[model samples]
Target: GFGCNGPWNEDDXRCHNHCKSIKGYKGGYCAKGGFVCKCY
Candidate 1:
C-alpha cells in the first residue's frame, strides 16, 4: 500500500501548485505566486 512518507508538506516549505498570492504583489514573485504587476 502506498503509505507514503514524504512529498507533501507544502512542498517542503516551497508551496506553489495552483496560485497562492497575487494581489498588490511585491518582490520575489510574491513568494512564488507570480505578482508584482507581472514582474514587469
Candidate 2:
C-alpha cells in the first residue's frame, strides 16, 4: 500500500513515479502540500 497523502507539487509532489510504478496504479490521494503515494 503506497501512501499518497500529499501536500504536493513539483517540489514535494514527486511520489507519482514511485506510486504509479506500483502494481497497476489504482490511483492515490492528492493530496496537498507534499508528494506521497497512496494505493491501499
Candidate 3:
C-alpha cells in the first residue's frame, strides 16, 4: 500500500520524483502540510 509518510517541505517536483522512484507509484502530489505524498 501507498503510505502517506514522507519528508517535510516537499513540493510537487520532489513528491513526483519521490513517488516515481522511491515508491514506484503511478503519480503523486504534495499535501498534508507538505508532509505527505499523494501517490495514485
Candidate 4:
C-alpha cells in the first residue's frame, strides 16, 4: 500500500487517476510510478 500522496493504501486512487484516469490510476498504474502532482 502507498502513503501520503497515494495511490494510498486503498483502491480509490486507481479509479480516479488513470483508467480512463480517475483516482484509481495511482493504485493501478501509478502504484510503483511514484511522483505526486497534487495541488493540495
What overall lDDT goes with each candidate model?
Answer: 0.25, 0.45, 0.63, 0.36
* Clashing pairs counted in every model: 0, 14, 0, 16
Tell me, by lDDT, which candidate is best. Answer: 3
lDDT per residue as tens, model 3, 3-27: 4445534567656766786555877
Encode model 1's per-residue lDDT on 1-40: one tens digit a residue. 0112133222311222122354532322222322211121
| Model 2: per-residue Cα lDDT over 1-40, one tens digit each | 1334444233223354555557976445544444444433
TM-score of each: 0.13, 0.30, 0.49, 0.18
Task: Please name the candidate that would achieve the greatest TM-score relative to the true structure.
Answer: 3
In model 1, the worst 10-residue window by lDDT is 1-10
Better of 1 and 2 by TM-score: 2
Error of 1 at 23 (Å): 0.4
Q: How accurate locally is residue 12 in candidate 2, as Cα lDDT from 0 to 100?
A: 22
Residue-wise C-alpha lDDT for candidate 4, range 1-40, written one tens digit per residue = 2222454343335333434334433433233434333321
lDDT comparing candidate 3 with the true structure: 0.63
RMSD of each: 11.8, 5.0, 5.1, 8.0
The alpha-carbon root-mean-square deviation between model 3 and the true structure, to one decimal in Å, is: 5.1
RMSD of 1: 11.8
